[PDB]
Symmetry: C3
């Protein structure tokens, strides 16, 4: 009939290996005295210093914020700042051995129709990769049909090369989810780190 032994399966594994290591699980814990998870989501390690972007609604009223990396390391995180208007928050973790960081191509712009992968921790199932495309822009938000669920907020939306296109945030309905464009997220992050708040 046919022998597919030497053929190559169509795959986005390259984007996964490049980006997924930098996407963390974020847990919002509350203190009767025992510390339990109140809500959860994802976050993206933006640079070597341990700065991480996540959504503000994921960390609101946390008595403790925990960050878990795909490689097994767990950290208690410091809340650097947050911004309600963009629903973004920045965390800081103090790691010793080096941290994986999300690929960022400063010159790339998402285009409608681009294939994208959503990376997050839906329903605490553990890191999950889902695929779709950029459905619309301007919304400003990117819209995508890459399946997003509770637990994906604050995680990454990357293209087939693993470059960050945005930070998943909202899920409207089938296949309607939104991400904050990476240019805006990066700008808000720098302001939160520099000023501790977004001056407008």
């Amino acid at each position: 009939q046919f022998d597919s032994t030497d053929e190559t399966p169509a795959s986005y594994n390259l984007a996964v290996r490049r980006a997924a290591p930098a996407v963390v699980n974020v847990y919002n814990r509350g203190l009767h005295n025992q510390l339990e998870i109140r809500t959860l989501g994802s976050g993206v390690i933006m640079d070597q210093r341990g700065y991480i972007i996540t959504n503000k609604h994921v960390i609101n009223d946390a008595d403790q914020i925990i960050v878990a990396l795909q490689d097994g390391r767990v950290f208690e995180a410091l809340l650097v700042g947050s911004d309600s208007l963009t629903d973004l928050a920045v965390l800081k973790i103090n790691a010793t051995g080096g941290l994986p960081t999300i690929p960022i191509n400063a010159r790339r712009v998402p285009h409608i129709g681009d294939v994208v992968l959503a990376i997050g921790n839906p329903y605490n199932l553990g890191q999950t990769i889902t695929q779709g495309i950029i459905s619309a822009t301007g919304r400003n938000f990117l819209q995508t049909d890459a399946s997003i669920n509770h637990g994906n907020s604050g995680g990454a939306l990357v293209n087939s090369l693993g470059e960050l296109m945005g930070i998943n945030t909202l899920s409207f309905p089938e296949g309607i989810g939104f991400a904050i464009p990476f240019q805006l997220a990066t700008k808000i992050m720098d302001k939160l780190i520099r000023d501790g708040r977004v001056i407008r």
Copy 2:
């Protein structure tokens, strides 16, 4: 490196997919015109004939068609076919109209990548991606390209931007949507215009 993308199909076809609005009098209040329902449509040729779904325009007191390039028109119902749930509209434009790419010899195959183009929940034109899941579903294509209220009457195109069908309705089931195949849609349209 080049990101994998269906942006070419989008640029070739999305310009011809319109936002359709069915406005009716609010007879429970003061008969003021208000949006009763909405969907999408596909501009089929330069004369301004547009295919949409019959259920989207049923009982409209006024049919509005909005193009992605900013132009807005009031449209006229040419006719409909309840069996296929298709309707044809006509707008009178000047300056030229974007039209949907049609390859009359392309045969849709199960597994072909498709993009559904429409206006779900009136959020503005939205592109979703899936494949052709089955055919002859009776003459209907089935697809897992996400379809939502607002997509009805819009275009289902392949990665080249060629029209594969007119999205009609989705079967909580996930990823089950149907479209009238383009050959049939076209035959029905010419008949409604003609007779």
Copy 3:
């Protein structure tokens, strides 16, 4: 213009694998009590399906995409994996599912789910492999499930999850409002379980 271009398509995977995926019907004394899918694993007529689909069946019917319809015999089942092995006896040759024992599934690989959701007739849906097992304790309670966003609905259980080459990656389980979260028993395990149920 686009006359000579070629539409992106997974029709090849479909042509290679879909003929071997069957519609399974569990009938009870009186009609249809429940339905699902199955995968013909070899020419002798051995078929894998899920145990829950055939539990308590008075008569198990198997329908092929080529239009042949058979009454199947239950060879055995395993509630752990929720797999059942059926046997049909046919005069004509039988289409079998492509199996590449050396293929290692990767997170990010494109996959097609093939089954009979809602008894609409065989349906192909596309997604990617979202995860290949879990190292820690998690909601599935298990460690080797393949997870995928290829749309899975009632009727898909027991059907095939294949890659773009048509190679069997796994057997889709019961349907999991979450969106794009579905699970399959990896093919290496399904193959081993089937052999054990056939021999003893």
